[PDB]
């Protein structure tokens, strides 16, 4: 099945993002035949969003919009970077967009090669100021509107941009290829005193005979898979996306619980403290009616279970209103298995009142 890549445009309001995106779809359809837009290269399927607002993007990443695998920074060469181009790139650093490609627009209106070079060098320097690899960044000199009008020269620069989407953004890793992890939902014992744990394989593959770690909540334990079960049917392996039972060697029912994960040994660790980006639902979205303050003590819902945590707000921040998004540092009352990028819900009394992403594990 065709690799899927999430991309986004970012840049000044009239430097050409929309026009560029229309040009990408038009020229690819012309060349290869046939809210977000979609388009295909021969090797890749793309879903493409625009990033007109900082808070809006951050809130969308948190509430479920797929994270950009690569972004397209659109700068009109007629101007060069604007004062706020700094801020566009800084959003990129903030959300950790892995790659940024640049499309310099309206290059047809800059007849002077040395001035195009000045702009190009400015963009590389701004990128490197935020630890993007400015010197190695693909920069396309194009013209979106003229490509859209069918000018072959400028169409070719659209195909150059698409090739860089193909070449410069790595094929994203598929769940089935990641180290095996199963979020544990229920725990039973069969009669041959064999413990079974159930769940939907999040990623990778568990085969009979392989060692696993049980991670989160309690001291990590080690076991060996002695069987995989799918609706009473005995299987030889369980794969990402499948609902399975995993039978375990020796470990007893009382020693495992919901909220732990099964994992390939040495690949996921339990943590108690992390930095996160959080969105608190508004009243209309079904969330809290009133603000909370520094002593807010909610539950953080990771995969299959709730963990109570305390929070630290950013310097200068004393109050969080429904509808805000902010950074917070969380300290859970016991550890849970987690990596950077892990989504969680924030709950009170069992009701979801916010959403977040682990931005950096701390301890």
């Amino acid at each position: 099945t065709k690799p899927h890549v999430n991309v986004g445009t970012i840049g000044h309001v009239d430097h050409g993002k929309t026009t560029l995106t229309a040009a990408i779809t038009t020229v690819l359809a012309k060349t290869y035949g046939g809210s977000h837009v979609e388009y295909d290269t021969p090797t890749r399927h793309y879903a493409h969003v625009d990033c007109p607002g900082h808070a809006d993007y951050v809130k969308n990443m948190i509430t479920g919009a797929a994270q950009m695998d690569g972004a397209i920074l659109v700068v009109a060469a007629t101007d060069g970077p604007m004062p706020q181009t700094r801020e566009h790139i800084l959003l990129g650093r903030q959300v950790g967009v892995p790659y940024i490609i640049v499309f310099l627009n309206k290059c047809d209106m800059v007849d002077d090669e040395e001035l195009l070079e000045l702009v190009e060098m400015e963009v590389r320097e701004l990128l490197s100021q935020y630890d993007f690899p400015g010197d190695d960044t693909p920069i396309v000199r194009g013209s979106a509107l003229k490509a859209l009008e069918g000018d072959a020269e400028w169409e070719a620069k659209i195909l150059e941009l698409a090739g860089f989407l193909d070449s410069y953004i790595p094929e994203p890793e598929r769940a089935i290829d990641k180290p095996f992890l199963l979020p544990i939902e229920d725990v039973f014992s069969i009669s041959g005193r064999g413990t079974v744990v159930t769940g939907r394989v999040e990623r990778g593959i568990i085969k009979v005979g392989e060692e696993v770690e049980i991670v989160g909540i309690k001291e990590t334990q080690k076991s060996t898979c002695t069987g995989v079960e799918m609706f009473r049917k005995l299987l030889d392996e369980g794969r990402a996306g499948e609902n399975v039972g995993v039978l375990l060697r020796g470990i007893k029912r009382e020693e495992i619980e919901r909220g732990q994960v099964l994992a390939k040994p040495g690949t996921i660790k339990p943590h108690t403290k992390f930095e996160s980006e959080v969105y608190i639902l508004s009243k209309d979205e079904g969330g809290r009616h009133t603000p909370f303050f520094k002593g807010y003590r909610p539950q953080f819902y990771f995969r299959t279970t709730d963990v109570t945590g305390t929070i630290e707000l950013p310097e200068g921040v004393e109050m969080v209103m429904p509808g805000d998004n902010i950074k917070m540092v969380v300290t859970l009352i016991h550890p849970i298995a987690m990596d950077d990028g892990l989504r969680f819900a924030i709950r009170e009394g069992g009701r979801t009142v916010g959403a977040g992403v682990v931005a950096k594990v701390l301890g």
């Binding site: 000044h12 309001v13 009239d14 929309t18 026009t19 995106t21 229309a22 779809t25 038009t26 809210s35 977000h36 837009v37 969003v49 625009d50 007109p52 607002g53 900082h54 808070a55 060469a77 007629t78 101007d79 060069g80 604007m82 004062p83 706020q84 700094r86 801020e87 566009h88 959003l91 209106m109 800059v110 002077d112 040395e114 001035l115 070079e117 000045l118 702009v119 859209l148 009133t290 603000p291 303050f293 004393e318 109050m319 209103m321």
Partner: protein, 280 residues
């Protein structure tokens, strides 16, 4: 003088003006940087004019206090990327400082004073920027609260320390009372609100005599909800702000709350649709 890329670079590094704008200005100016800057100044008024009809619903609220005098200010732009920009911020701060120093409450006076700076700013940022409104609050004790850039509050008080005033400002930011005390709601407004609630109550089938007594109850709730002292204190909602003030032997004599883009309708965007429209 020759219009080399390095001369364009020098002008651009000095001004932040767009590359081709700098090239054009220098060329007409025969390479004189100062005259080129004057050329861009005249051109910038027209660039700004072109943007002046763009909706600018983002930006900042700012507040500053000078003893018994405080200013609250809204300066708008189109996107929050610009709201965060250092140059935009320095502009908004500069306007704020001038309104405090001159005690300026007429937003048109502030506009005239800063129109040339605003235009040069718009000419380099490429968004409509607008000094939208300004107000002063005077008082014995003044405090403020900023809920990031989007909500600012001033509070005037009597007998309150720093912490109390700030917590009251925080409360106002969250709960947006429009009066200080429930008795401040005018007789005219209470009588109209009464007729509203009685009509509603009657058409739901409540007998008149019942509906009247229920609406009396609703009027107390109504004046309580729109007034600072009648509202539950956000930090301890089991007591009203009036009760909190009484406990500290303090009073509130004024407040102002501004929120970025209040009263400007939110334009919805449809990127996918706009991309499909372009393809034609």
């Amino acid at each position: 003088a020759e219009i080399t890329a390095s001369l364009v670079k020098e002008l651009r590094e000095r001004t932040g003006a767009g590359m081709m704008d700098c090239k054009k200005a220098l060329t007409e100016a025969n390479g004189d940087i100062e005259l080129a800057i004057e050329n861009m100044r005249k051109s910038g008024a027209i660039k700004a004019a072109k943007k002046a009809g763009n909706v600018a619903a983002d930006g900042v609220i700012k507040t500053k206090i000078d003893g018994n005098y405080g200013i609250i200010l809204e300066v708008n732009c189109q996107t929050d990327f610009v709201a965060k920009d250092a140059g935009f911020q320095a502009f908004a701060d500069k306007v704020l400082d001038a309104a405090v120093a001159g005690k300026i409450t007429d937003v048109e006076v502030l506009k005239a004073q800063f129109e040339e700076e605003r235009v040069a700013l718009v000419a380099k940022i490429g968004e409509n920027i607008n000094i939208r409104r300004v107000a002063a609050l005077e008082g014995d004790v003044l405090g403020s609260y900023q809920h990031g850039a989007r909500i600012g509050v001033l509070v005037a008080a009597k007998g309150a320390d720093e912490e109390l005033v700030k917590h009251i400002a925080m409360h106002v930011a969250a709960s947006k009372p429009e009066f200080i005390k429930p008795e401040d709601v005018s007789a005219e407004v209470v009588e109209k609100e009464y007729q509203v609630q009685l009509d509603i109550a009657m058409q739901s089938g409540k007998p008149k005599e019942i509906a009247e007594k229920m609406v009396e109850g609703r009027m107390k709730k109504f004046t309580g909800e729109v007034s600072l002292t009648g509202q539950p204190f956000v930090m301890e909602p089991s007591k009203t702000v009036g009760q909190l003030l009484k406990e500290h032997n303090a009073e509130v004599t004024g407040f102002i709350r501004f929120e970025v883009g209040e009263g400007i309708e939110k334009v919805e965007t449809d990127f996918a649709a706009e991309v499909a429209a372009m393809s034609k």
